[PDB]
Amino acid sequence: DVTNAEKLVYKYTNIAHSANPMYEAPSITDGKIFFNRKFKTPSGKEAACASCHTNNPANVGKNIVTGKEIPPLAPRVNTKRFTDIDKVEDEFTKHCNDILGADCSPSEKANFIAYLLTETKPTK
Template identity: 40%
Template structure:
């Protein structure tokens, strides 16, 4: 009985450890995920940092662009245009907390894309922005 209990405890610990390991995501994980999603509708898609920068700094027909609040330099602190609240840098090299959890990344893409575009961002747009943020210096 004791061996069986020990085995169950070890198996449970392994499952928990695996879950913890998967919870720590990297910018490269998000880039790969969004590229793969984009390739479902465009098989040859490859993320472009250049397109990501253009997307980030363009108003898309509205008053705001992503850079309105986040600045054109993703390594710099921004400020929300309405509230004046400080926004930490977007570039993972300048702010390791960026692009670190699905919950946070999806929350902010969802909210900010609706503010800037009036719709959700496509996987291709997300991949391009992530590629640009990953290539931004400190």
């Protein structure tokens, strides 16, 4: 839910600030850029988080590999997101590894979850 998501932003901010002292607080601008940024897959094809989750994380997504819909990421819209707090940190680490080849950094996670807190309305 939103409660657990918000608490994770503080957790990852404090980890990030220890590792990278110039980082002090989340940037929702940077979280949004991270979500939409086209990165290069090994093949040379570009992809972004938004390729599967759409450019609005309040919307239902679609996996470009399998065609399967994906529930929204924004926890105000899909309140199940982040409720499974014993597992969701490990699951996010696994997912970053799957999509990008390595875990997302603590500042990337703080910025991204803070951005998710701000996306409360689906695109119509």
